[PDB]
Amino acid sequence: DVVTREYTINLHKRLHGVSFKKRAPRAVKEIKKFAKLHMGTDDVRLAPELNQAIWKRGVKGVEYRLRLRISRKRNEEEDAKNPLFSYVEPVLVASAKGLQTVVVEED
Amino acid sequence: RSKADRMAKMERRERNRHAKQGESDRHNAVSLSKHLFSGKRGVGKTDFR
């Protein structure tokens, strides 16, 4: 079931008490685990525009709230995982506050 | 050529068990070194920290 939604994600409560050399690499593994919870897939991808959005304030200055877009798609032939995989990508907005989850229509 | 290519790999095998990192590693292992065991260590200056 191809379904694409929006999400904020509170990276302040997930990076609590982590060493400063491992905050930005941990925030990558937190999003791969966040996509597994909502979509229920194992193959999670991150567009390189999302990688720039985490690492922009150095290793130790990861933002509190990101605003993600997660697309669940069909997988290609002769892949032995499962036919579905997520694709996490960013949507830029002025403030990440005050926004709740919204189902994106397709066309 | 494939018969003599096999005779290389039948006779390389004895050197890989000794982990020769070439066919040119003939660094010989000494049984016993003198500076380890030939001494009587007492009060005073000694031969190692």
Binding site: - | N16, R17, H18, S33, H35, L36, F48
Partner: protein, 178 residues
């Protein structure tokens, strides 16, 4: 070619081998006893979950100072462990022994692993360096893997002497009891 002691029919049996495999030996002994005696199609389903941290290989013999884990409760052992490089060779031979039984034309579901054996191979001598200029060995422990799968077969007048008195006793009770 000169297997271990086998108690089976060599007509309805397939086999496979692996020699000089640069593995650990103690890690491959304990992953062979976990799979011994099982059914073949359940054995391949088992080793996949070892790689995914669902079920564990229990360490029975070579198991000192191993940390405890929770997944050995299925076996009644507190010490278990999930060796990855041991399984990637052992299921490489189960995938071999299946296709050997395909070529003879043996049954798919009745096939089970009966004999599986792992013993020592010649070690790779490599050297390292310690304090005070001392040279100590740093060597491996490769192994020989060999296994035989088998179709399950659904199947599972001592002369006696007695004296002339003991002969007369049974003859007496036969006379009385009608």
């Amino acid at each position: 070619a000169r297997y271990g002691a086998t108690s089976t029919n060599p007509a309805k049996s397939a086999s496979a081998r692996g020699s000089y495999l640069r593995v650990s030996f103690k890690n491959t002994r304990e992953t062979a006893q976990a799979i011994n005696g099982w059914e073949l199609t359940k054995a391949q389903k088992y080793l996949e979950q070892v790689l995914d941290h669902q079920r564990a290989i229990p360490f029975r013999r070579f198991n000192s100072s191993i940390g405890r884990t929770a997944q050995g409760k299925e076996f009644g052992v507190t010490k278990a462990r999930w060796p990855a490089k041991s399984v990637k060779f052992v299921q490489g031979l189960l995938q071999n022994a299946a296709a050997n039984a395909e070529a003879k034309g043996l049954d798919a579901t009745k096939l089970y692993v009966s004999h599986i054996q792992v013993n020592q191979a010649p070690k790779q001598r490599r050297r390292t360096y310690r304090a005070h200029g001392r040279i100590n060995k740093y060597e491996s422990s490769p192994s020989h893997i060999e296994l035989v799968v088998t179709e399950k077969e659904e199947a599972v007048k001592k002369v006696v002497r007695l004296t002339s008195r003991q002969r007369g006793r049974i003859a007496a009770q036969k006379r009385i009891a009608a």
